[PDB]
Amino acid sequence: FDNSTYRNLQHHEYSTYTFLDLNVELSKFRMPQPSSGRQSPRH
Amino acid sequence: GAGGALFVHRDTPENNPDTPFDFTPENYKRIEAIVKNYPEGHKAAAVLPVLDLAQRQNGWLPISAMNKVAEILQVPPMRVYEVATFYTMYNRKPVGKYHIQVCTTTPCMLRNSDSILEAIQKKLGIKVGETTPDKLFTLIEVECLGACVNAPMVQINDNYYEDLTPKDIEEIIDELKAGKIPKPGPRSGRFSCEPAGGLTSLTEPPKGPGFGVQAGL
Amino acid sequence: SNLIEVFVDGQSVMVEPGTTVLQACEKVGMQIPRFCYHERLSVAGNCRMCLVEIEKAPKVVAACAMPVMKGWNILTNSEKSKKAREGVMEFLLANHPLDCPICDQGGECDLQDQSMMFGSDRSRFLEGKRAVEDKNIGPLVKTIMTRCIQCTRCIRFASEIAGVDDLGTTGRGNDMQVGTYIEKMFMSELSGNIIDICPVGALTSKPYAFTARPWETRKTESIDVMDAVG
Amino acid sequence: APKKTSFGSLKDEDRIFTNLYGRHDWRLKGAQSRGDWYKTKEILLKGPDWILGEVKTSGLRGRGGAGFPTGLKWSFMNKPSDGRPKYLVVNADEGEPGTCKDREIIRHDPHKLVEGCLVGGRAMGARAAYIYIRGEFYNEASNLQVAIREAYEAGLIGKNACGSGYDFDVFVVRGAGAYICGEETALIESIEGKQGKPRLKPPFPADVGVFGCPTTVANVETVAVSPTICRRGGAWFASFGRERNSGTKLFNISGHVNHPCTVEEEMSVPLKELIEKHAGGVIGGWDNLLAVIPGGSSTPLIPKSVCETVLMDFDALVQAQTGLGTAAVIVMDRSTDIVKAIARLIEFYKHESCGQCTPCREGVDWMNKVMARFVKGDARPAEIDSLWEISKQIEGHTICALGDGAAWPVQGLIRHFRPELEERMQQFALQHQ
Amino acid sequence: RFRGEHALRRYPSGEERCIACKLCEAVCPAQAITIEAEPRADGSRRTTRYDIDMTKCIY
C-alpha cells in the first residue's frame, strides 16, 4: 500500500482521436435511440 | 480588451467555398458513431462534435469545412456559422502547430501569470495575438481554465502545464521545438491538486467496500 | 369554464390558461412596452423591455413570455416596473448611434417613442460607443447595422414566416452581430417585411431612402392589384 | 450529543472522494476495492421512491453553486411517462474562476460519477445520462470515456445495467470553450447543437428540457455523492454541518495562500481554520490578509474583518452578504491591487456574456469600461454611486444569472473598499489636474 | 442674436451642413419651409428642394 505514487499517467499517451475512438468503441453497447417520428424538425 | 477577430467572412484565395475539404473515411466512421448517440430526428445535436472533428483533421475551420458539416448533417449553413463564431475553441483562422493558451484570470493572475506571459513573449519573439514565422507557435490569453489551484498554468493542444515559472515555461518551449513532447501536469514536484507539502488529508488507507453501508441493504 | 381570474392593477379579468402577462394586460386595454415580442413571431424574451412586477413577488417577470397564474395581480405602473423600463432603455441607448436626423426611422421609431414615454430624459453614459460594419443583403433592404438593438425579429421572421435560414447572429456578448456572415442576398418574395418589423433604422427601404418623413405623409387605405390575393 | 457547534475536523473515514489526489488506481478495479459500484443492484431494486427519500433525508443541496435542495428538485421528474424519453444531464462545465473540484472528480474518480449517473437516472426514471464536460478538459473526458467503457464491459451500465432489469446509457458530450454553457438551459441548448444561449424559465427542464424532453441537470459533485448517500444513508450524510447545511464539501483554496489546493471538509467549517490548516495560511501571516472571495468570482468578496469569524456554509455566508457559491476560496493579501482583481473579474464576465439579453450584453460591457477607468483613477467620486445603480439595473433584469454574477463583485468592492477607490481618484486628479 | 434673412451654411470643407432631417419644416409655425430630398450621386443624404417663403415667414 503506497499512497505516495500518482498512478494517473494514461492521459500522457492520449492522441487527438482518442476520445472519438472510444466513442466508436462504445457505439456497440448502446441501446436503440428513441425517435420523435420525423427525420428533422423541418420534415 | 477587444476581441480583435472579425465575425464576418470575406472570401480569400486560401479560404473560399471552393477550398478543398473532405473528411477521411475514418472520420466518416467517427461521424456515424457521433450521430448515433442522439435521438432520431435530432441529428443537428452533432454540430458541436462533428465541427470539432473537422478542426481536428484540418487544424482550423475553413468556410468549406462549415459547408461540409452543414451538408452532412442537413442543417442550414448559417446555423453552423453561428456555432463556429459563438464558441472560442473553433479556429476560423489558421494557427500554429502548437497553440499556447495562458490563463490570466484573477486567481491565475494573482500567482504571477504576467511573468509567464512575458517569459513566453521574450522566448518566442511574438506578441499575445501573433504566430511565429516558423508557423509552429501561436500565443493567446484565455479566461479561467479550471486549473486555478495549479496557477500559473498554460494549455497546449489538449495538455495542461501547471505550476509554471519563467524558467519552466521556457524549457517546455525548448522541448516542444526540438521535436519532443513534454509531460503534462504540475512542474513543482506536485503532480496533483495536493498541498505543496504535507498532504493534510487523505493519508489513511482507503476503506473497504460496504464499510459504511446502512442496515437493510 | 376553464377561464382563470387574474388582476391587472387590481382589476379582475378572465383569461384562457397559458395566456401571457402581456395578453392579460392587453385585455384591459393596456399596452406593455416591447421591442422583441411580435404576436406573429415566436416568443424570444431577449429585449427585456416588457418586465413587470407581480404583487407579492420580488422578481419582475417578462410579460411577453410568462403565462399568467390564477389569482395573480399584475402591476403595470408600479415603481419597480417603471425603474425596470428606465434601466432597460438606458442599456438600449448606451451604444445606439446619434443618427436620428439621418435615420429614415426618425418619426416612426419605436425606440424613440418608448424612450420618450417610458425612459429617462438624460444620459449618464460617458464611454465611447461601439460601431459595426454594414451588411449588404440585396437591393431592397438597406442595412445600417450600428442601429441594431439585437431584437432578433428579422431572424425569427426569416426562419418562420419566409422559410429561409439565411439570417443569424455571429459572435457573442457585446460583439454579437446580426447578419449572414457571408456575402449573401436575402432574396425572397416576402423579404421587404423585415423592414416593417425591425423597430429601428437598422433595416430600411432602399428605394424609399431619404425621400419623406412620416408626419408629412397622407395615408390612403387601399387594395393591391399585383396578384389575385387582394 | 446533537447540534454540534465546532465543525471542521473530519477524518478520512468519512470522506466520499477518497481518491481526490489521484494517489490510487483511477480505473474500475481501483474504484471497486475503494467501495465504488457496491450494492448498486440492491439500490436500483429499492426503487425511485426509496432513492428520492435518501436524498431528501440527507438534506443534500446542489453543489453547483445555487444550493437548491437536491431531493425536492429530483422529485420533479417523478411524474408518470407521457411518451417522451427522460434524461439526466450532468453539468461538468466547471467554468467558475477559482473552481477545480469537478475536474478532479472526473479525472480521479470517474466511476463514482458513472454510478451516480446510474442511481440518479433510476431515481428520476431517466432513460440515459448525458455528461456535458468542458471542452478544455480533453484528458479528463478521455479518462471518463475509459471508465464508461470498462463499466459497459463489466455490465455495470447499458442493457439491464446489473442483475437489475433497468437499461441505462451514459454519453459524454464535450463543449467548446463557453463559460455560459455551464448554465443548465444554455447547456441544454449547446447539447442540441445551438449557440449556448440560456432559455427563459418557465418552462423548467423537468417539463421541457433537452430535445424538448423532461430533463434534470445535476452538478458533478451532486451526482457523485448520490450513491454514497444511498448506501450510507441520508441520516449519516446529514450528521455533518449545521442545519440546512448538511454533508461534506470540496473546497478549492487558491490565490495568496502558502499551499493552494483542493480538500474535502465538513460543510460548516470556519473559513480561518480551513485556510490556515489545509492551505498553509496566507503568505505574510493571517494579518497580511486583505480580502477573500469565498465561492468563486460570482460571489461578493469579504474583508478580513468578516473572514476571521464566518462559517463556510450557505446561510452563514448569506448573512455575511456574500454567498457560498461553488466553495472556491480565492485569497488576496495586503500586497495586491484589490480594484485590479475585481476589474479582471468584470473583464472575464464581459468576455463570457452570450449577448442574448439587453441588460447583460450592454451593462456588463459598460461596467467593464467603468471599472477599467476606476483602476487608473480617471473617474470622479460621483460615478461610484452611479456604478452601483448600474449594477442594480443589471441584477434581476436578465434572463440568466450571469448578470447577477457580474453585478455582485462590483457591489462587494464598492461596499467594502470605497475609500481605496476615492483615494485613487484623488491621486489621479492630483498628478493630472 | 438678431434674426435676419435666412441662410444655408457649409462645413469648412465646402460640403453643405444640411442633411434633410426636415425638423425645420416640421417646427415652422408658418409652414414657410418646403423640403424635398433624395440620395445624392455619392449616396449622401441631401436636399433637392429647400424653399423658404419669406412672405409666410414670421422670423
Ligand SMILES: NC(=O)C1=CN([C@@H]2O[C@H](COP(=O)(O)OP(=O)(O)OC[C@H]3O[C@@H](n4cnc5c(N)ncnc54)[C@H](O)[C@@H]3O)[C@@H](O)[C@H]2O)C=CC1
Ligand atoms: N459550478 C460552476 O462552475 C459555476 C457555478 N455557478 C453558480 O450557479 C448559481 C446560479 O445558478 P441558477 O441555476 O441560476 O440558480 P437557481 O436558483 O435559479 O436554480 C438552481 C437549480 O435549481 C432549479 N430550480 C430552481 N427553482 C426551481 C423550480 N421552482 N422548479 C424546478 N427547479 C428549480 C433550477 O432548475 C436549477 O437546476 C450561482 O449561485 C453560481 O454560484 C455559476 C458559474 C459557474
Ligand SMILES: Cc1cc2nc3c(=O)[nH]c(=O)nc-3n(C[C@H](O)[C@H](O)[C@H](O)COP(=O)(O)O)c2cc1C
Ligand atoms: C453563468 C453560469 C454558469 C454556470 N456554470 C456551471 C458549471 O459550470 N457547473 C455547474 O455545476 N453549474 C453551473 N452553473 C449553475 C447551474 O445552474 C447548476 O449546475 C444547475 O442549476 C444544477 O446544479 P446543481 O446540481 O448544483 O443543482 C452555472 C450557472 C450560471 C448562471
Ligand code: SF4
Ligand atoms: S433608429 Fe430611432 S433612435 Fe435610432 S437613430 Fe433612427 S430614429 Fe434615432
Ligand code: SF4
Ligand atoms: S436588424 Fe432590426 S429586426 Fe433584425 S435584429 Fe436588428 S433590430 Fe431586430
Ligand code: SF4
Ligand atoms: S445574463 Fe448574460 S449570459 Fe445570461 S442570458 Fe443574459 S446575456 Fe446571456
Ligand code: SF4
Ligand atoms: S432639414 Fe432643416 S433642420 Fe434638418 S439639417 Fe436641413 S436645415 Fe437643419
Ligand code: SF4
Ligand atoms: S417662420 Fe421663418 S423663422 Fe420661423 S421657423 Fe419658419 S422659416 Fe424659420
Ligand code: FES
Ligand atoms: S484562473 Fe487560471 S486556471 Fe483558473
Ligand code: FES
Ligand atoms: S418584449 Fe418581452 S423580453 Fe422583449
Ligand SMILES: [Mg+2]
Ligand atoms: Mg425598420
